[PDB]
Design a protein around this ligand. Structure first.
Ligand SMILES: O=c1[nH]cc([C@@H]2O[C@H](CO)[C@@H](O)[C@H]2O)c(=O)[nH]1
Ligand SMILES: O=c1[nH]cc([C@@H]2O[C@H](CO)[C@@H](O)[C@H]2O)c(=O)[nH]1
Ligand SMILES: O=c1[nH]cc([C@@H]2O[C@H](CO)[C@@H](O)[C@H]2O)c(=O)[nH]1
Ligand SMILES: O=c1[nH]cc([C@@H]2O[C@H](CO)[C@@H](O)[C@H]2O)c(=O)[nH]1
Lengths: 303, 201, 299, 298, 302, 262, 300
C-alpha cells in the first residue's frame, strides 16, 4: 500500500528438456519438453509478488504469442506489468535447458531494448520505490543509469552469469547487495575460492571496491554473508531434497529484498532467503505457487 | 512526399441481429475488426498511403487486429501495443439500435506518444489535451466526431449548440473543389466504383 | 473414484455489455467470458467436487481453445469434446435485462454418431446432464441409450425445449421456468394455483421429477410418486442473474449422486442458484458444498 | 506518498545574557533551544514533516516550547511531558564567557517511551538523534531502526563517545575537530590527518562521515570510498548558535530528497551559512529556494 | 638481436598429466602419468627462446626440487631464469590434467610475484624490447607492470576467464590482448554468438582503450582489430590436433617475436597462427622443433 | 634388539582436491603406495620394506627412512622410472616398477623374510611372486587381485544383505582362508574365523575428511601378542586416525593415541 | 492606476564580433543583439515590472519594425516610436574579444523637439523620464525644460556626448556618468580614488542633485546635494559580458525611485541589477527581476 518494489530484469520463454532414465550425448532419447515462463528478473518479481509485495516489472518482450503469454501469466501471478516494454519487430528472449544437467543456451537480445531512455521515461517512479532489483541481463549503460539515478534507493543486483556480472565491477560502490556464486565471485574478484578458507579475502576485495553487503553462495558449505561495516559470518544450508534446482537464487533475492523492506537484520534475512531458496528447491516448477512468508518461516523454524 | 496519418481508435466489433425478449432470441453474431480510425485507414488503403496511430492491448484481440489491419495494406509498426490494458471494444445491436463502448485504452494515445514521430485524421475518443495537442501542432498541415459523450450529425451538434465520410477526405489529396455490405467494409473497394455510381446514376 | 458425470451441452463465447443509461454510443464495460449452459453446469459440477466430463463442440478458433483451456482449468475433463474444423464457436450476446442474441450452429455438430463413439462411457456414468441446445436426434439418442442412467435435462429456452415433450417419459429431472413450462404443458401458469395442473400434465406425459422455478413464488418441486411441495426463495442481493439455473441444475445432479432426498436437493440447488446470483461472474469460483450449507444455515 | 522525518532530541530553554566583577545591567533573552528541537524546526522550514520525540517538565516553559515549536510547523504531539522534573536549560553569558547546561530530563527519553512509538519510528524516512539522550536510548534507536537510516548529532565531545561502539549502526555522523579527535583518539593537527581519522571511523563501521573543520572546510567521506573536501561558504557571522543543527537538517532533508553526498554537504553548508548569517538561533527565512540561491552564488 | 631482450612475467607450474579402453574410475584405472614443465608464462618464455629471442623469465618457484628442476630445464632450453624468485616455505605451482575431463590448478606462489620484487628489477624491465605478462599473477603486480612499463609494449595473456578481469580497467595500458571466445565475452559483456558481434566486442575493447585486439576463436579463425581502424579476419591453419595444450603460449610468443622483428599486424597474426599450428601437432606442451623457418613453411603452404 | 617384513608398493602420490574449463583447487605431492604406507604406520615396529633413478624415488625412500622404516633392501632399478599414483578426489596408476620385483629379488632375501615375525603382502605384484611368498612363507603368517582363487589356503587374515555375508565369509573359509577382516563401512569391520568366532564391529566415530593403517594395526597387534578382537579395535582406531588427517599418514599416529581413542 | 515611465533614447542594432584578426577567413563568434542605451534601459525597466514607453527613432528597414516588435514582446510599449520612411535604423558594430568600435547613429537626430512636442501631454504625465545623450541638444532642452516637475534621469552614454549636460545640471534629478565623462564635465582630475571627492562638489555647485560615479579598484560613489554622500561596495561577479551593465544600473535607480526607495539602497539595488547584467553573455539578462536582484544583494 504505497510501498512498492521495482524490478528491472529479463523475461524469457523457457524450453526445458528431460530424458527418460539417463541421457547421453548420442541418439534421440524420448522424454518431456516444457514451455515455462522464465527470466531472472521476471522470476524474482513473481516470487516477490508471492511474498506479499507490490512488484512492478520493467522488462522487454516481443509482439509474439510467447511475449503476451509471459505478460498475461506474470500479471496473473500478482505482478504489475503495465509498465513493461513490448517491442514490435523483435523476438521474445528464450532459454533452452536440459535439466535433471547439460549446457544451457540463452537467446536474449531483446534485453538490450531495455534502455537508458526507457528507464528515464519511468524516472521518479523508480526513484520513489523502497527497493530496486536489477539483474545483469540488461545493458551496461542501463545498469549505469539505474545505479547513478537511484536517488538514495538501495539497489539489489543479481549477477545472473559469470560472464555477465562484470558489468557491475567498476560500479560496486553503487550496489546495496550482491549475491554471486563461487564462479561469479571468482570472476569478479580474481581470487580463488577453492575453499571455505578463501572467502574472507574475496569478501575483503569486494568491500575494498565499495560493496556494502555481500551474499556469497558457496553450495554445500552454505551461504557466506559479509557487511562492509564489519559484520561477517557463515550460514548453514537448510536440509532439502531437490526436485528442480531452477529458481533458487531468484527466491533468495526476492527474500532478501522483502526482508530489507520488512526491517530485518542481515543475518536473519539471509536465513529467510535461504528458506525461500529451499522452497524453490522442493518444487518442480521454477516458481512455487504456494511460496509464502508463512511457509518459509515454518521451514526455517522447523529446521 | 505526401503521407497520411490517422490518429484514431481500433476496436473489436461484435455485431448482432436478433430480428419473449427473455427467451433467447435467435439470430446472427459477427466478430469483425472495428474502430473509427482503423476503418478510416482501411478505406485509406481509396489507395492512399496511410499510417495508423492507435493503441491496442497485449492480447490476442489486439494482435489479430493489427495482423488483419496489416494485411489490409496499412502499416501497423507505429501502433502502440499497450501493456496492462485491454483492446477497445464495441457492442453494436444492428438489424443502430443500441451501441455500447468499452474504450479506456484511448488514454494511452496521449500527447507524449503523439510527439515522437498531408492530412491528420483523428476522432473525439482521444483525450482532451492530446486532441488539443495535435490541434496545436497542426503546423498549417490539414474532426470526424463519434457521439455526444465522445462530418457530424445534428444529434450531437445541437448538444454543443465519420467512417465511410472519412475516406472521401482523400479528395483533399486529389484537389477536388467541394453501404449495404456484410463484410464491414468492402474487401476490394476502389474509387473507380464510386465513380461508377455516377457512370450509372 | 470410478464415479463420474457426463454432460452433453453447449459451449458458447459470452459477450456481455453493461452501460450507464442507454440513449440508443452509450459508454460502458464489455466483457468476454466463457459461457454455454452445458459448459457452465459442468464447471459448477466440478466445483461441487464431482468428476465432470463435458461432451460439447467448439470451433477450432481461439474462442474454442480459450473455452477448453479455461474449462479444463476449472477442473473439468474436456478431452472428449468435439473440435469442428469448418464451423465457428457458438456465441451469446447480451445487453445487461435488455436484448439477448444467440448464434449457435455448431450445436448441431454434437450428433448421435459422436455420442455413439462415447456410448459405454456415457452409459457408465452416474448421471447424464443434457441441454436443449443440441439436436432433437442427439437428445433422442441419449434418452434411448441412457442404459438405466438418470438423465437430467435443462430446457435452456422455451423455443428449443419442446423437443423433450414427446420424450418426457425418458427424463429424470426437468427444470423449466414459467414460460418454458407454460409452452410445454399448454396450461397457463398465471399464479400459484395453476402449478398443480401443470405438474399433473407433465406427470401424465411420463416426467418423473419436475423442478419448476417460479421466481418470486419460489421453486415448486413434484414427483410422479406423489411427493410435491413448494420451496421458499432464499432472498439475496442481485448482481448477476446469469448462471442461476446452471448452478441449480448442478446442485440437483450433485445431490442425486450424493443419495439426497428430493426436497433437500431442491433446497441445495436453490442455494447454488443464490451463490450464482451473488456473483457478477457467470461461475462463482468459490462455490462449494460447505458455503451452500452455510447459506441454507442462515435461512 | 506518506513521507515524514522523526527527530529524537532535546528541547531546552536557552537564556542569553548580554551586557566578571560588578553587577552588570543588560538584556536577558529567553529563546527556544536544544539541538534536536532546532534540527526539527529547521527541517520543518525545509518543507519536511518533522516529528519531535522529546521531554519537557510540565513547566510553563515547556508548554511554551511545545507551542512555539508547533507554530514553527513541527508536530510535537508525541513529545513526553514529565511531571516532577524541570525542562532542560542552557545558560549563556555573552559579552561568550560562561556556558552552563542543565539537562537531566533528557534521561526521561527512554527505551520504553520510544518502544511505544516503535512502528512509527520504523516507518519513517530518516531518524535524527542527538547525543543528549542516554546511551541506552541511543542503543534502542540504533538496534530497532529496522533498516531506516539514523543520523546522529554528536552535540558535545564528552557526550558523543556513547555512540563510539554503535558507529556500525549509524548512517551519517557530523562531528567537529575536537569531537572526532576525542572519538578516534587521532590528532587532527593537520589537513592530512583527516584521511587517517576518517579511516579510523570507517574501520569501526561508519557509513558516512561529515567532518566540519572550521576555516579549513568540510571533509566528507563514505565507507565505499567517496572522499573529498568542500570549501567553507565565507559569510559574515552574527550569531554562531544553530549552525550545526541547520547543517544536520540540511543533510537529512537532502537524503530524503535523493541527493548525492557531496552536493548534500554543500547544501548543508549553505544552511549553516544561513544560520550564521542570523542573530536568531533558528533562521526564520531558511528555505530550500534561498539556500539554493546562496549556493548558486559560489 | 644482440643485447635485445624480452622480459616475461609469468607462472611456472609442474604439470601432472594422466592418460587413460575406457575409464575404470574407482578401484584403480591403469594408464600413463607424465610430469612435464608448464605454466603459461614459462611456456611463452620457452617458445620465445626457440624463436631466437633472448628471454628472461620473472617467475616464482618453491624451494622444492620441482622448482630447481623447472629452472634447470628452462635454462637448458635457452631461457634466462637467473632472476627468478625461489620461495622457501611455499610449494611450486601445479596443474593437474585428465586428458582425452578434470582440470585442477594449485597456484598460490604466483602471488609471490609482487610489486616490490618487480620493482627490484625495474630498470631492467624498462630496458626490454617487449614485456610479456600473464593474468596468473597478482592484480597489484599487473598494475605495477602497466604503470611502470616506461613506454615498452605490454603483451598480456588472459590465461583464464576468471583471471583476466584483472586487466579490464587497465586495458588502456595494454598493447595487445589475446583472448578466446569466453574470455572476451566475460570482459566485454557482449555475446559472441555471431561473427557480426565481434565488431561490437572489438568496439567495446577499443572504447575502453585497448590498442590491439587479437581475438582467438577456436573455429572460424582469429579476428584481429586495431584501435586505429585496421580490422580483419584470419583463417585457421588446418592441422591434425594431437594435443591442444600450449597453443596460446606459442601464439603470444609469435606475436611478440613478430613485434620486435618489425612485422605488420596481420602477418604477425598469421605467423602466430603458424606457431599455434606447430603447437597443436605436438604431444608436448612445447614443440622442441618450433622455429621461424618451420612456421614459415606452414604458412607458405597455407 | 633382535625382533617385521613388508612387501608392498612405493608410489608417488599426486592428490587433487577441487570444488564441485579451469577450476582452481589443491594439488598435493605426498609419498605413497600401500606397502609403503603400511610400513610407515608400523614404524613402534622394526620395519623393513621390500624405485627408479629419479629424484622422486630417493625422496620417497629417504622420507620413509626418516619415518623409521628400514629401506636398504628395497629395489632401486636404474632402468625404469619411479611408479606414480594419481588421485582426483578417479584414480590413474602408472605402476610397472612394481613388476621389477621378481623371483630372484625375493629369493635374495629369503632367509631374512623367513626369519621375520610377520609378512605383509599386496595384491599388485605378480601372481608368480605372490605364489613365491605364499609357498615360501616357512610357517610365517602372510597378511584388487581376483587371482587369489585357490590360494586362500595360504593367507593368514552378493553382499546385498547382512545375512548373506555368512555365505560369503563361509565361502572364504571353505576355500581355506583362516581369518577374514571384511571392511564395509556402514556395518564396520566384520571378523570371521574358521574356528567359529564370528562377529561385527562398529566404526570408531570420525568425520571422513585408511585400510593401510588398518592392516598395519592388525599386524602390529599380532606381533604384540594381542587377541583378534582387541587387534581389530586398535586397527579400527588406526583407520579412524588415518581418516581424521588430510595427509596420507598421520604423523601423530601412535599406540598411545589409539588406545586412548578406544 | 495609470502610472508609467517614458524613455527618450536611441535604438541600435548591435553586431558583436569575437575572434581572439590580421588575416582573412578567420572563424569566430558573431552575435546580433538589440541595443541602444534608451532601448536597453527601457527593456530592463520592463523586466523590473515597470510600464515602459520608448520614444525613439527607427528606419523604414524591416529590421527596425522587427526591433520594435522584439522590444514590445519584452514588455515595452513602442507604439509612440518614430518610424522615418526612406532611412535606416541606427546600428552599432563592436569588435570584442572591447577592441574595435564603429557606430552608425544619425537617425538619432531625427528625435526632435517637435516630435517630443507631439507627445508632450503624455511625457509630462509620467513618473520618471529616462533620456539618453544620443539625442539632440534641442530635444534634451525640450525634455529638461518641459519636464513639468517630473524627475528626469539622464545617461551620459559617451564622453564626447556628455558635454550637453554640463551647464544644465540644474535641470537634472540624477546623472550616472563614468570616470572620463565626469572629468570632462568637471575639470577636476581623475587620478586616484581619494582626491576625486571634490568632483562631486563641483557637480553639486553647478546644481546637480544626485551623482552616481562608477569607479574601478572597488567602489561606486553616490552623492546628494543635501549632504547625503557615500561609497558602495562591489558585488563579486563573473564577467561573462560587460555590455548592458550601466543600462541596468540606471533602470534600477529609476525603478527604485518610482517604488519610493532611499538613495543609497537604490544604488545598491542598481549594483545588483548591474551584477545580473554581467552574468549574462547577452546584452540584456532576460531573467532580471526584483526578486533575483534582491537575492543577489542579500547574499552579498
Ligand atoms: O543467462 C541467463 N540464463 C538464464 C536466465 C533465466 O533465469 C532462470 C534461472 O532461474 C532461468 O530459468 C532462465 O529463464 C537468464 O535470465 N539469463
Ligand atoms: O440459446 C441460448 N442462450 C443462452 C445460452 C447460455 O446459457 C447461459 C445463461 O445462463 C449463458 O452462459 C448463455 O451462454 C444458451 O446456451 N443457449
Ligand atoms: O550540552 C548541550 N549544550 C547545548 C545544547 C543546545 O544546542 C543548541 C546550539 O546548537 C542550543 O540551542 C543549545 O540549547 C545541547 O543540546 N546540549
Ligand atoms: O590456471 C592456469 N592453468 C593452466 C596454466 C598453464 O598454462 C599451460 C597451457 O597453456 C599449461 O601447460 C598450464 O601449465 C596456467 O598457467 N594457469
Amino acid at each position: 500500500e504505497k510501498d512498492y518494489v521495482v524490478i528491472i530484469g529479463s523475461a524469457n520463454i523457457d524450453v526445458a528438456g528431460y530424458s527418460h532414465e539417463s541421457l547421453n550425448y548420442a541418439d534421440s532419447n524420448p522424454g518431456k519438453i516444457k514451455f515455462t515462463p522464465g527470466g531472472v528478473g521476471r522470476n524474482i518479481a513473481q516470487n516477490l509478488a508471492l511474498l506479499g509485495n507490490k512488484a512492478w516489472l520493467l522488462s522487454a518482450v516481443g509482439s509474439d504469442f510467447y511475449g503476451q503469454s509471459l505478460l498475461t501469466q506474470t500479471n496473473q501471478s500478482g505482478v504489475y506489468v503495465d509498465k513493461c516494454l513490448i517491442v514490435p519487430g523483435e523476438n521474445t528472449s528464450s532459454y533452452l535447458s536440459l535439466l535433471d544437467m547439460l549446457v544451457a543456451i540463452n537467446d536474449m537480445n531483446i534485453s538490450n531494448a531495455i534502455t537508458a531512455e526507457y528507464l528515464a521515461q519511468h524516472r521518479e517512479f523508480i526513484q520513489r520505490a523502497k527497493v530496486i532489483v536489477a539483474d545483469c541481463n540488461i545493458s551496461e549503460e542501463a545498469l549505469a543509469w539505474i545505479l547513478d539515478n537511484a536517488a538514495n534507493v538501495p539497489v539489489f543486483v543479481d549477477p545472473v552469469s559469470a560472464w555477465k556480472c562484470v558489468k557491475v565491477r567498476d560500479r560496486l560502490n553503487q550496489i546495496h547487495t550482491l549475491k554471486p556464486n563461487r564462479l561469479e565471485a571468482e570472476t569478479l574478484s580474481g581470487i580463488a575460492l577453492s575453499g571455505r578458507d578463501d572467502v574472507a579475502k574475496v569478501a575483503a576485495w569486494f568491500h575494498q571496491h565499495g560493496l556494502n553487503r555481500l551474499v556469497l553462495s558457496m553450495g554445500g558449505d552454505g551461504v557466506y554473508y559479509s557487511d562492509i561495516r564489519g559484520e561477517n559470518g557463515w550460514s548453514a544450508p537448510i536440509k532439502t531434497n531437490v526436485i528442480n534446482v531452477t529458481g533458487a537464487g531468484d527466491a533468495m533475492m526476492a527474500g532478501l529484498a522483502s526482508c530489507w523492506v520488512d526491517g530485518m537484520p542481515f543475518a536473519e534475512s539471509v536465513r529467510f532467503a535461504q528458506g525461500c531458496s529451499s522452497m524453490a528447491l522442493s518444487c518442480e516448477y521454477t516458481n512455487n505457487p504456494d511460496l509464502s512468508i508463512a511457509n518459509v518461516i515454518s521451514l526455517v523454524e522447523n529446521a
